[PDB]
Amino acid sequence: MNILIFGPNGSGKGTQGNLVKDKYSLAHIESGGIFREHIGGGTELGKKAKEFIDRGDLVPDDITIPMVLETLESKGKDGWLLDGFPRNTVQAQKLFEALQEKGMKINFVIEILLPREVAKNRIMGRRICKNNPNHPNNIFIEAIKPNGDVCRVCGGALSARADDQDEGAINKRHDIYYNTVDGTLAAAYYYKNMAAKEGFVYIELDGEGSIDSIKDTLLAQLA
Ligand SMILES: [Co+2]
């Protein structure tokens, strides 16, 4: 099973990604990890890429795409979940042409849908418990609202994380994600629009439901 996943920050994408890569035994391949294996490990492509990075430029797509394809072929040989690439329509199209050339096939594309302002609030509304940071508390997700000012699990103190409160940072990432001209949504639609012509199934997940709720709907559809 080769699966591409798309979703904004605030959509719970990583959580769902992990449930999918576990049931199904996939290699989870994300954009960051690809660069490490290659730049870090100095494959022929990684050495060429690092020249760009070290002067503050982006790696050209003509180097990025084959870097991705190498990692899918090595790390992802027994099945992969590709997460966080492509981000735009040019990448998306070049990735798909490159997969077709290697005769590598997509089986599923998953998009987690959530309106922008909802995603941003779910990020900002996170509260971390002083006693156990795994305890879920969010001022904007009803089912896990804090108990007054304290953790709804253990009563410990709650704080906000500065990165969650940085609206500029959040907005710049959403601006790319929710860009329907040529951003990540446009890249997801590129897959959506050809799915049944190319023998894969596109799956839209409702990002507003609980973790367990999304996971059930997703599992149901992966067979
Ligand atoms: Co707690």
- CATH assignment at residue 91: 3.40.50.300
Distance 159 CA to ligand 1 centre (A): 11
Distance 157 CA to ligand 1 centre (A): 8
Given the DSSP bridges, would you call strands 128-129 and 158-159 parallel, antiparallel or unpaired? antiparallel
- Write the DSSP assignment of 202-216 as a string of letters: EEEEETTS-HHHHHH
Domains contained in the chain, number: 1
Which sign, positive or negative, has the C-alpha torsion 13, 207, 178, 96? positive
Binding site, annotated residues for AMP: 31, 36, 57-59, 84-87, 91, 161, 173
Q: What is the C-alpha separation between 113 and 136, in angstroms, rounded? A: 21
Distance 146 CA to ligand 1 centre (A): 10
Residue 223: C-alpha distances to residues 23, 66, 100 (Å)? 11, 30, 23
The DSSP secondary-structure symbol of 48 reads: H
Distance 123 CA to ligand 1 centre (A): 18
Binding site, annotated residues: 10-15, 31, 36, 57-59, 84-87, 91, 126, 129, 135, 151, 154, 161, 173, 209
Q: What is the C-alpha separation between 67 and 43, in angstroms, rounded? A: 9
Degrees (nearest 5) of the Cα angle 91, 95, 101?
A: 150
Distance 81 CA to ligand 1 centre (A): 32
Tokens of 7: 């979703």
Residues with CB under 5 A from ligand 1 (ion): 129, 131-132, 135, 151, 153-154, 156
Closest CA to 82 of 92, 100, 102: 92
Closest CA to 26 of 1, 52, 44, 58: 1
In terms of residue numbers, what domain contains 210? 1-223
The DSSP secondary-structure symbol of 142 reads: G
Hey, how many other C-beta atoms are within 10 angstroms of the C-beta on 10? 26
Q: What's the distance, CA 164 to chain centroid?
A: 17
Distance 12 CA to ligand 1 centre (A): 20
- Polymer length of the chain: 223
- Residue partners of 146: CB distance under 8 A and separation at least 6: 127, 137, 139, 152, 158
Answer whether 68's CB lies under 8 Å from 37's CB.
no
- Residue partners of 179: CB distance under 8 A and separation at least 6: 88, 185, 186
Q: What is the C-alpha separation between 162 and 149, in angstroms, rounded? A: 18
Residue 152: C-alpha distances to residues 41, 83, 122 (Å)? 45, 32, 17
Answer whether 91's CB lies under 8 Å from 64's CB.
yes
Method in brief: X-ray
| 66 cis-preceded (ω within 30 degrees of 0) | no
Distance 142 CA to ligand 1 centre (A): 17
Query: Within 13 Å, how many C-alpha atoms sit on residue 164's CB side?
Result: 16
Element (H, E) at 169: helix 167-177
Distance 135 CA to ligand 1 centre (A): 5
Query: Within 13 Å, how many C-alpha atoms sit on residue 4's CB side?
Result: 27
3-state SS assignment for residue 115: coil
Q: What is the C-alpha separation between 189 and 217, in angstroms, rounded? A: 21
Amino acid at 152: R
